[PDB]
Ligand binder design. Structure first.
Ligand SMILES: CCCCCCCCCCCCCCCCCC(=O)OC[C@H](COP(=O)([O-])OCC(O)COP(=O)([O-])OC[C@@H](COC(=O)CCCCCCCCCCCCCCCCC)OC(=O)CCCCCCCCCCCCCCCCC)OC(=O)CCCCCCCCCCCCCCCCC
Ligand SMILES: CCCCCCCC/C=C\CCCCCCCC(=O)OC[C@H](COP(=O)(O)OCCN)OC(=O)CCCCCCC/C=C\CCCCCCCC
Ligand SMILES: CCCCCCCC/C=C\CCCCCCCC(=O)O[C@H](COC(=O)CCCCCCC/C=C/CCCCCCCC)COP(=O)(O)OCCN
Ligand SMILES: CCCCCCCCCCCC(=O)SCCNC(=O)CCNC(=O)[C@H](O)C(C)(C)COP(=O)(O)O
Lengths: 110, 178, 104, 128, 63, 70, 84, 219, 124, 88, 459, 175
């Protein structure tokens, strides 16, 4: 149902897998920079879909998925706003980050 | 850096230092090479006019007005070499500098790799152990009463001797260890 | 500590200190990571005068620009339904003084 | 002639602009010589203790010990109650407290007066 | 081959987990995923009801 | 991942044909895009709707009477 | 795999002050009885591929010729297609 | 307050950039002036235009920093523009990328920077705002063009001023691809994004002819 | 703008204040006073949820343009006619605002001239 | 980085190359061991100019206290090699 | 509640009957088991309390403090293992006995249905701490330090005893439940003012309140590492717990008697923070940071609002864990260098990278980086204070900035820069020290997932 | 979903437009959503059906706890500790339920603002009024009690409020 939320949360979630694997063996090899670059490019390509779906229709959602706590009458929950600004700035930031990471593979080689 | 400093700078040394500083700041002002050559020849001509002055008092009166003129027109953003004490990479690689004694704390499994390197290290250790006992007596006999006047050290004078206090000058980490 | 000689062979090159020499009472104030007293190409008083003059002039000119604004030779923008009464706050049970827009 | 440079506390005088270095007398040369002599003696002592293969610890610096002791533990025995110390202590330790007390007491009095008069509009103010 | 495994373990599995979590746990509670109301233009028709929005007032068109 | 190019010491560096062709291609692409957009959308730079002259409007449409009625 | 190919320096007699602004500097200096002792050291900066410069306007118009040709061809194609 | 803070920020930072010698410092002061322009846009009640400028600045400023880093690495970690001379032919891809990015930064028509900066200037010219802030923004635009000129002139046009051992090299696919992706972006993304997003503010259809061209005139 | 120079260097009372404009009744000039028309109703404008600042007298063209942009999605440059119509209507709105400004300026001019003539007649 | 590992032969070649471009020196007379003041008849300001030219050639600067006592090309080469840690 | 008390008592015969080389193992294992048992106290109700018997009861204010107290003992044993290596078996057993006795008193003190039993145990905690400081301290100032730590406390708390017995002569009871259910307003009288002062100052001196904080740098610097840990983590929180308990009978006088102390805290949190900027000792810097944090907790308790109490509880727990970790890191440096001076051993990130990571995480936690529970408590207190008065933010904001500064100062002086050349006895960090740091830091990050467990009874 | 009551959490009928394609170009959104369906929604549906049948094989129940009403603080003797205890516990339970009612109304307000989008200032007016009423009642009941709040303090606050209202009404009638 409504792939908007699934895709938007999938981008952010798969941006974190290399941080989880930073204690694995790949972090001790020289393939890690390429691994992070490939992850960022895949995340950008994935995030390009909710932008298309907003462009076609104007899809806008709020996702309050995890409830952190409730101080009496105030409820604090893990909530994501996926409005025009978010779904437009995510692809741009991911594109620029992919370019910068590929550049850094050459700049920071030594 | 390597040379031991003296108690004072003579007039000649101060004049030379002013000339080098003024040339560097003129180069910073005149970016293009031919313009810099022109104004550097002009500066040299202005500098050696008073070369043959004989008295001390008026020579010292110059190089004072000269330093004031230098300070007034000193190009507040001079060019600095990247590794110089103001350059953009001055202490860039000092976080990669590790002392040699750290290798004494390696696990035997780590020292299992590089056996030849650690054998050479033990040879160096033995050489240092003997040379130190020789060096202490050398420096004791050589030094004047009341301690050393200047912080300059003597060379080795015998056949098998090593220069006193050599271990931490020879065993510098490197300029770019990694 | 910043204006000590950077080319001397100090025992502590980062701190620019020698073993055994007396330590200034306020060494931790001057550690090259904090306040330094190095001579500047321009005098302190001149620097202060110029910076304060620039800031004061900018503030005064912004105040003047507030007094004397800039705009275009147009009248107010007109909105149809009583200046959008219902869509701006609402209160649909008070029947406001209706406003009418003059066609020219 | 060029405009003069005026030193300040946070922008000191360049060493090259000091008239003291252009007034050279034999006593100044002897002072510089003995300064370098004590510096060289200290450097020789440190370098002898530093290059020792037998030493396996920290080279104790009496200067650092003196600095820390003077900064921490030598203060009170050399403290003397004078007009300057008394006035500065009174000001720096009492003035801020009374200033801030006046500020907060005045603000809370104004707020309580507004609440009692009923004109504060505390709508939606649930959590306090 | 490496790209296929990367697309499987790094995109497909997380999207499966997130879609399950959203479709069967997050939406089980009210107002957890709130959606902006879609825009309705004159002349449109609704799938739920089937009614047709009447057109506009025929503005006098020129240039 | 590049090719081997040796230093030159005071001579012009060795250049690859690929980089020259790529740079010239991208510059030509930029200039072609600018010219194409200006040809097709010229109003984005010069405007499309003329600015009227207010002083040229007659007093009739401005509701101006000949200084005696009111 | 590193750059170990034993690069050889050119011949020092190659660098001449002639045909460079350093020559004009030398004339202006000799007008006062002065001379440049390091003039030949920098002649390499005006000798090889560095001998020719490009203006700022020429730098901005790096690929205007090919771009303009392609634009003309494309607009001609658009005219020959729309007028059909 | 937002409008005034933005105006003073953009003017002051462009003025500082006008005379810097480190290339990274010049690009950083350009970034700060662009941020000031973004705050000026916020002040005149145009948030969507400010977001659009954010999106375009990302592309072209990131490309500018990559080109600067390429020069720095190729000249043995040297950053002062006094010591980089004729690089227009010695490294042509960085040259063309830097020229295109500088043209986009200065609001050259029909580039990525056009669709944001041109609208910012048109919007600030036709609003009930400060006169001082408007003048500061115009001078800031002129100074933007001026410091882009400084970068190009001192880094690519003259005779070489770097040490004799020439190690100039661009032929690495990573660097070329990374730069060229953002080059294509800084050419076309403005047009694509502006044509794809829905309208979020009333346009400035009719303006005086001199006032429509003011950004180009000052640039 | 020249009006800024006229107001700030000349006579302030001679020219209108944009904050309190208009200062004269709509019927002072002529008693015809035809009313403006609205094509888009309240409910359809709310349903399209344009913007509070976009719900002006040109909103029917904006609604048509949004219907366009939604319907022909992949062709993001399909109907440029609707953009042109919306821009033309906004242009006409702006020229009406300019005409209102000019009318108020001329009315202020004639009011000041009336005051001066009455003062001169009373002086005589 | 991609900087070649310069050797003592390269340092000596570059030092002599810079010195041969100094027209105040006759290229026939000078050698690696040729002293500046006596064998070549140069002034102190000429020496400081030579040191500055070496600094420009090699991209790093020599402190004045170390520079003022470099009187032969051989010890200039030795100083550069010691600074750059070039054993070979 | 005796299910925790009896094993803690059995720790003593277990220690004294142990083999000469197995005391540390037994004590650590059984202390960890007791902590696991104590974890069950965290299951609380929104209603009154867990009234186990007529003597002991537990609340959601007592439960986090009890869990922290039980958790601290294994860490103190691990850190004490090192510097007591060359000690005789009997004196090692005596040290462990002092730690166990201190824990037993602390556990009983936190339950303590009655107020004079609370006074007796809250004072009994003074003797083991004094013996620890003055027997196993390294420097000659320990004796003086001990004197201060003793007499200050007693000077504050001898009047409290009088007040307590006086209250029982008029109210008839000191049981906290009856005290709460039968509370009456305090009229504005000089006698009531002095009763308020007597009830408050005993817990004021132990926070410590600014101006009454002179014992703390001495006691924390001169004590051994276990003493420093127990002082910074748990013993400072006794004053906060007591103030929370006893403010129920001091209303509405607290509305205006709190003004002298609030200022002393709000301005004081500035001064002590600024003191941390110019400090040549690591332990002294950590001690003054503790003073600043407890000053903010004082402001929270005096404001007397629900958000204030929740923030105060969270901040007590967070500060306890953070200060213990920072003291442990400083001690790891000290056991290598033997100096306790910040400027001497430098550039330690190159030589010990994982310990540098521990230092970074500890500094970030002390800096109140979100979503750490340190920031949760600080933000709740700041919001409550803004409701109290909109000007407080200024002072609060200043403190926040200053905190970051000195925190990163400590991180940059010791870990960054160039290593000291002449120090060549910096061995790689042992598994014991790394495990100590991990066991300090992991509970903080886990507690950030369930903050309601440390937000007090007013959650 | 039946998991929650639709009356407590109201929602509009949620009318949506129908696809009216004006060009012959195929939009990528429909192909991408069909691909998403085939590659994501079907495996997820299958896994959920498997887990749901596994749950159905083992079904058990839990119940909502009911609480009797007890006399409140207004009918307790001065020192009668047992009645005060019962009344205090009842008052605390009522306070928690009131907090949760306020939470529910706040959730209603927040959901509506997002759903309305651009016309939220006019469209969400009904939601806003409910929040104002509930907030006024809650603020009257429970504000300024302090950290050591109790049923007695709430009763005293209500008593003084009633005294103020009575005095105001008497002075208004006798005006
Ligand atoms: C981003 C989410 C990704 C999640 C992936 C899983 C992450 C697991 C982290 C586990 C906790 C680590 C604790 C520190 C010690 C770890 C042991 C160790 O030394 O590892 C060496 C190991 C091997 O390296 P090595 O070669 O041995 O190291 C040599 C040197 O030591 C050199 O070592 P180094 O230089 O690599 O230093 C270690 C490294 C990492 O070390 C750390 O600093 C760990 C602690 C970081 C936070 C510090 C406390 C501040 C308060 C944060 C509270 C967060 C609680 C979250 C819940 C925690 C539940 C357990 O330092 C840093 O990266 C700087 C940290 C700066 C973080 C800035 C932002 C922090 C807060 C951001 C918000 C997070 C919540 C978002 C919620 C909203 C959206 C969901 O490398 C690692 O394991 C790196 C750990 C990854 C760090 C991730 C930091 C972000 C995650 C924070 C905790 C979990 C967040 C939960 C939400 C996830 C979504
Ligand atoms: C309120 C701010 C109060 C000032 C706080 C003082 C902090 C004291 C301790 C700081 C530690 C000392 C320190 O870090 O050294 C200073 C350090 C070193 O200087 P460098 O230039 O980097 O030199 C390096 C090259 N050699 O630099 C600094 O960090 C100084 C920062 C001090 C900032 C103080 C001025 C800030 C005033 C802001 C006013 C504007 C208000 C906001 C306007 C916006 C309107 C909405
Ligand atoms: C770290 C240093 C802190 C030292 C402690 C500071 C707090 C001192 C508290 C005051 C001491 C007196 C304790 C009284 C115990 C409470 C009992 C009580 O309040 O009952 C009052 C008794 O009140 C008193 O008697 C108070 C007399 C005070 C005498 C002792 C003075 C000690 C110094 C007082 C000034 C210092 C206080 C602040 C200290 C500031 C910091 C050092 C009513 O008595 P009745 O006669 O039965 O009822 C009256 C109706 N018929
Ligand atoms: C852009 C910044 C502005 C720059 C302004 C600077 C102004 C500089 C002009 C000042 C003129 C002077 O030198 S002030 C003149 C100072 N007095 C003398 O020169 C007398 C004796 N000179 C020496 O001894 C020297 O060392 C010498 C013989 C030259 C070398 O000797 P060698 O080599 O054999 O060692």
């Amino acid at each position: 149902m409504n792939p908007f939320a699934s895709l938007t949360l999938t981008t952010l979630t798969i941006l974190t897998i290399p941080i989880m694997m930073s204690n694995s063996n790949i972090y001790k090899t020289n393939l890690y920079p390429n691994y992070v670059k490939t992850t960022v490019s895949y995340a950008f390509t994935l995030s390009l879909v909710p932008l298309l779906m907003f462009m076609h229709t104007g899809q806008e959602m709020i996702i309050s998925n995890w409830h952190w706590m409730t101080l009496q009458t105030v409820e604090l929950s893990l909530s994501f706003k996926m409005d025009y600004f978010s779904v437009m700035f995510i692809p741009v930031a991911l594109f620029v980050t992919w370019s910068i990471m590929e550049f850094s593979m050459w700049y920071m080689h030594s | 850096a390597f040379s031991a400093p003296a108690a004072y700078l003579t007039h000649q040394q101060k004049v030379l230092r002013l000339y080098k500083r003024a040339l560097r700041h003129l180069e910073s002002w005149c970016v293009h090479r031919d313009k810099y050559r022109y104004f550097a020849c002009l500066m040299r001509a202005r500098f050696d006019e008073h070369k043959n002055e004989k008295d001390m008092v008026k020579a010292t009166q110059l190089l004072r007005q000269a330093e004031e003129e230098f300070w007034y027109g000193q190009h507040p953003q001079p060019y600095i070499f990247p590794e110089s004490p103001g350059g953009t990479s001055y202490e860039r690689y000092e976080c990669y500098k590790v002392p040699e004694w750290c290798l004494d704390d390696w696990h035997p499994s780590e020292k299992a790799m590089y056996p030849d390197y650690f054998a050479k290290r033990e040879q160096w250790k033995r050489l240092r152990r003997e040379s130190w006992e020789r060096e202490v007596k050398q420096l004791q006999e050589e030094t004047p009463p009341g301690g050393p006047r200047t912080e300059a050290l003597p060379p080795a004078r015998k056949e098998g001797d090593l220069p006193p206090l050599w271990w931490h000058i020879v065993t510098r980490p490197r300029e770019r260890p990694m | 500590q910043q204006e000590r000689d950077p080319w001397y062979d100090w025992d502590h090159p980062d701190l620019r200190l020698n073993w055994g020499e007396p330590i200034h009472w306020d060494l931790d104030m001057y550690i090259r990571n904090r306040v330094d007293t190095s001579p500047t190409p321009v005098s302190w008083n001149t620097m202060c005068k110029h910076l304060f003059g620039f800031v004061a002039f900018m503030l005064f000119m912004f105040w003047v620009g507030e007094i004397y604004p800039s705009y275009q030779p147009v009248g107010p923008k007109q909105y149809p339904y009583n200046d959008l009464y219902l869509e701006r706050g609402g209160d649909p049970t008070k029947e406001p003084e209706p406003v009418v827009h003059y066609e020219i | 002639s060029f405009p003069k440079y005026k030193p300040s506390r946070l922008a000191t005088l360049p060493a090259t602009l000091d008239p003291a270095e252009y007034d050279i007398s034999p006593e100044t040369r002897k002072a510089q010589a003995e300064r370098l002599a004590i510096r060289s003696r200290l450097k020789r002592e440190y370098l002898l203790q530093y290059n020792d293969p037998n030493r396996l610890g920290v080279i104790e610096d009496p200067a650092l010990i003196r600095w820390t002791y003077a900064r921490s533990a030598n203060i009170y025995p050399n403290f003397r109650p004078t007009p300057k110390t008394s006035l500065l202590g009174a000001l720096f330790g009492i003035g801020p407290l009374f200033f801030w007390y006046y500020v907060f007491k005045t603000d809370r009095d104004k707020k309580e007066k507004l609440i009692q008069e009923g004109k504060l509009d505390q709508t939606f103010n649930i959590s306090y | 081959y490496r790209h296929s495994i990367f697309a499987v373990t790094h995109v497909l599995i997380p999207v499966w987990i997130i879609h399950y979590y959203l479709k069967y746990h997050v939406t089980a509670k009210p107002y957890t995923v709130v959606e902006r109301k879609p825009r309705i233009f004159p002349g449109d028709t609704i799938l739920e009801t089937g009614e047709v929005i009447p057109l506009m007032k025929e503005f006098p068109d020129q240039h | 991942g590049g090719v081997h190019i040796e230093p030159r010491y005071r001579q012009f560096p060795q250049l690859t044909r690929s980089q020259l062709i790529q740079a010239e291609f991208f510059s030509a692409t930029m200039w072609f895009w600018i010219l194409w957009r200006f040809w097709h959308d010229s109003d984005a730079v010069l405007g499309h709707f003329p600015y009227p002259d207010p002083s040229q409007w007659t007093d009739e449409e401005l509701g101006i009477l000949p200084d005696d009625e009111d | 795999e590193h750059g170990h190919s034993k690069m050889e320096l050119p011949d020092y007699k190659q660098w001449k002050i002639e045909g460079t602004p350093l020559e004009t500097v030398q004339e202006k200096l000799a007008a006062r009885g002065l001379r440049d002792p390091w003039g030949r050291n920098e002649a390499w900066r005006y000798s090889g591929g560095f001998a020719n410069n490009v203006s700022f306007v020429g730098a901005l118009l790096k690929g205007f010729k090919w771009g303009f040709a392609a634009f003309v061809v494309a607009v001609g194609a658009e005219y020959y297609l729309e007028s059909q | 307050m937002t409008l005034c803070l933005g105006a003073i920020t953009t003017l002051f930072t462009a003025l500082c950039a006008i005379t810097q010698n480190d290339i990274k410092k010049i690009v950083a002061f350009s970034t700060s002036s662009q941020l000031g322009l973004m705050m000026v846009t916020i002040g005149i009640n145009q948030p969507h235009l400010a977001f659009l400028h954010i999106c375009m600045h990302a592309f072209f400023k990131a490309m500018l920093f990559m080109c600067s880093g390429s020069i720095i690495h190729s000249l043995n970690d040297e950053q002062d523009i006094r010591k980089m001379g004729g690089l227009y032919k010695a490294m042509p891809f960085t040259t063309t990328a830097l020229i295109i990015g500088s043209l986009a930064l200065t609001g050259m028509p029909y580039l990525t920077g056009f669709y944001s900066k041109d609208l910012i200037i048109e919007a600030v010219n036709m609003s009930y705002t400060n006169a001082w802030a408007l003048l500061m923004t115009l001078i800031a635009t002129s100074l933007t063009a001026a410091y882009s000129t400084r970068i190009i002139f001192f880094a690519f046009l003259g005779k070489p001023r770097f040490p004799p051992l020439v190690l100039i090299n661009e032929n690495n696919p990573l660097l070329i691809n990374s730069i060229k992706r953002l080059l294509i972006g800084s050419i076309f993304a403005g047009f694509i994004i502006s044509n794809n997003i829905p309208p979020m503010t009333v346009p400035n259809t009719t303006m005086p002819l001199y006032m429509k061209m003011t950004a180009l005139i000052v640039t | 703008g020249a009006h800024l120079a006229r107001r700030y260097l000349g006579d302030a009372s001679k020219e209108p204040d944009p904050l309190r404009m208009p200062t004269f009744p709509p019927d002072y000039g002529f008693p015809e006073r035809k009313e403006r028309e609205m094509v888009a109703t309240q409910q359809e404008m709310n349903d399209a949820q344009l913007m509070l600042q976009q719900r002006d007298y040109c909103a029917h063209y904006l609604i048509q343009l949004l219907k366009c942009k939604r319907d022909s999605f992949p062709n993001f440059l399909a109907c440029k006619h609707e953009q042109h119509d919306w821009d033309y209507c906004e242009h006409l709105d702006y020229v009406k605002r300019m005409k209102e400004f000019e009318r108020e300026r001329r009315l202020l001019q004639r009011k000041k001239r009336r005051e001066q003539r009455e003062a001169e007649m009373a002086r005589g | 980085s991609d900087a070649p590992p310069l050797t003592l032969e390269a340092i000596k070649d570059r030092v002599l190359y810079v010195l041969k471009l100094y027209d105040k020196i006759d290229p026939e007379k000078l050698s690696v061991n040729s002293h500046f003041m006596k064998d070549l008849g140069l002034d102190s300001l000429d020496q400081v100019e030579i040191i500055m030219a070496m600094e420009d050639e090699f991209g790093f600067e020599i402190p004045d206290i170390d520079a003022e006592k470099l009187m032969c090309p051989q010890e200039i080469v030795d100083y550069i090699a010691d600074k750059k840690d070039v054993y070979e | 509640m005796l299910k925790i008390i009896i094993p803690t008592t059995m720790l003593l015969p277990m220690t004294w009957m142990s083999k000469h080389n197995m005391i540390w193992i037994n004590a650590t294992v059984h202390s960890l088991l007791i902590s696991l048992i104590s974890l069950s106290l965290l299951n609380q109700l929104g209603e009154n309390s867990l009234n186990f018997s007529l003597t002991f009861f537990s609340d959601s204010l007592s439960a986090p403090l009890l869990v922290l107290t039980t958790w601290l003992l294994p860490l103190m044993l691990m850190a004490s293992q090192s510097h007591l290596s060359k000690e005789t078996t009997t004196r090692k057993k005596l040290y462990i006995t002092m730690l166990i006795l201190l824990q037993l008193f602390l556990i009983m003190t936190f339950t303590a249905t009655e107020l004079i039993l609370f006074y007796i145990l809250f004072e009994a905690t003074l003797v083991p701490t004094l013996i620890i400081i003055t027997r196993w301290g390294n420097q000659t100032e320990r004796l003086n330090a001990g004197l201060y730590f003793l007499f200050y406390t007693l000077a504050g708390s001898l009047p409290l005893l009088v007040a307590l017995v006086y209250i029982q002569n008029t109210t008839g009871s000191l049981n906290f439940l009856i005290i709460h259910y039968w509370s009456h307003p305090l009229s504005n009288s000089w006698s009531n003012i002095f009763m308020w002062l007597a009830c408050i100052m005993a817990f004021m001196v132990k926070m410590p309140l600014y101006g009454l904080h002179l014992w703390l740098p001495k006691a924390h610097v001169e004590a051994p590492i276990a003493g420093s840990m127990v002082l910074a983590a748990v013993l400072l929180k006794l004053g906060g717990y007591g103030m929370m308990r006893i403010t129920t009978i001091l209303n509405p006088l607290t509305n205006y008697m709190a003004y002298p102390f609030l200022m002393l805290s709000m301005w004081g949190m500035i001064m002590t923070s600024s003191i941390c900027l110019r400090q040549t000792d690591l332990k002294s810097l950590i001690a003054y940071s503790s003073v600043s944090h407890m000053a903010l907790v004082i402001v929270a308790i005096m404001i007397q609002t629900p958000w204030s109490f929740m923030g105060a509880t969270a901040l007590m727990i967070a500060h306890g864990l953070t200060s213990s970790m920072l003291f442990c890191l400083a001690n790891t440096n000290y056991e290598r260098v033997h100096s306790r001076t910040m400027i001497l051993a430098r550039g330690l990130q190159t030589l010990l990278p994982l310990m540098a990571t521990w230092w970074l995480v500890a500094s970030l936690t002390n800096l109140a980086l979100p979503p750490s529970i340190n920031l949760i408590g600080e933000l709740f207190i700041i919001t409550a204070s803004f409701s109290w008065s909109n000007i407080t933010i200024i002072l609060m904001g200043m403190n926040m900035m200053i905190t970051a500064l000195y925190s990163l100062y400590m991180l940059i002086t010791t870990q960054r820069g160039k290593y000291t050349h002449h120090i060549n006895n910096i061995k790689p960090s042992f598994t014991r020290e790394n495990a100590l740091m991990a066991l300090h830091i992991l509970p903080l990050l886990l507690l950030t997932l369930n903050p309601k467990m440390i937000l007090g009874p007013l959650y | 979903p039946d998991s929650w009551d639709k009356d407590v959490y109201p929602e509009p009928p949620r009318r949506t437009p129908a696809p009216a394609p004006q060009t012959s170009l195929p939009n990528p959104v429909t192909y991408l959503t069909k691909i998403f369906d085939l590659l994501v929604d079907r495996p997820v549906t299958l896994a959920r059906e498997f887990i749901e049948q596994q749950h159905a094989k083992n079904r058990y129940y839990y119940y909502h706890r009911e609480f009797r009403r007890v006399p409140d603080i207004t009918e307790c003797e001065e020192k009668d500790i047992l009645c005060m205890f019962e009344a205090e516990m009842q008052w605390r339970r009522d306070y928690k339920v009131d907090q949760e009612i306020v939470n529910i109304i706040q959730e209603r307000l927040k959901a509506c603002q997002q759903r309305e989008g651009e016309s939220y200032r006019q469209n969400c007016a009904k939601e806003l009024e409910q929040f104002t009423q509930v907030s006024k009642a809650f603020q009257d009941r429970y504000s300024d009690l302090g950290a050591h709040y109790s049923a007695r303090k709430c009763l005293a606050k209500q008593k003084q409020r009633m005294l103020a209202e009575r005095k105001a009404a008497k002075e208004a009638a006798a005006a």
